[PDB]
């Protein structure tokens, strides 16, 4: 919990805080996304040291992969808003307003399903 799961959850939340920075702050949003993706990459690399070379994904691999998906989707959200703010100038800010709540909600439901699964398994 303290070695892998809290680092992953903190990284996933650390990606989503960038949604409160203004859309025009390109370098800041970019560095949030990149650094959190690197955090997830190194977490994935280190987690493999705890086991032999098993040839199938474990539960912690599922959790790490889903958190990685949330991180990379957070980066993709900034990429999309940065594209549309230039290409079709705006209402594009509703992308930020939606993601800013949707990502936390979806990650929360992911946890409510995952832990509800493996504590009863």
């Amino acid at each position: 919990v303290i070695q892998t799961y809290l680092p992953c959850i903190m990284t996933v939340i650390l990606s989503q805080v960038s949604f409160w920075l203004n859309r025009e702050s390109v370098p800041a949003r970019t560095v949030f996304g990149v650094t959190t993706v690197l955090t997830m990459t190194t977490l994935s690399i280190s987690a493999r040291n705890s086991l032999p070379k098993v040839a199938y994904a474990t539960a912690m691999d599922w959790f790490i992969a889903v958190c990685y998906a949330f991180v990379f989707s957070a980066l993709i959200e900034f990429a999309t808003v940065n594209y549309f703010t230039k290409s079709q100038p705006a209402s594009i800010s509703k992308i930020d307003k939606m993601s800013r709540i949707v990502f936390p909600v979806l990650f929360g439901t992911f946890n409510l399903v995952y832990w509800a699964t493996y504590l009863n398994r």
Partner: protein, 56 residues
């Protein structure tokens, strides 16, 4: 973005190949990793070329 991706590629090269003996010839993942490195390096070089085409 590009420099950080280059950094990550150079980082993972060692963290992967450290599990293999120090043979001189290339493996499958050596070809794959250098191919991906070429793509990442070109992704970085593209913006420098974009600056050179712009400021000229």
């Amino acid at each position: 973005l590009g420099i950080t991706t280059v950094l990550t590629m150079t980082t993972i090269n060692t963290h992967l190949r450290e599990t293999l003996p120090k043979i001189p010839y290339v493996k499958a993942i050596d070809m794959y990793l250098m191919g991906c490195f070429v793509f990442v390096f070109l992704a970085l070089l593209e913006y420098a070329f974009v600056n050179y085409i712009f400021f000229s």
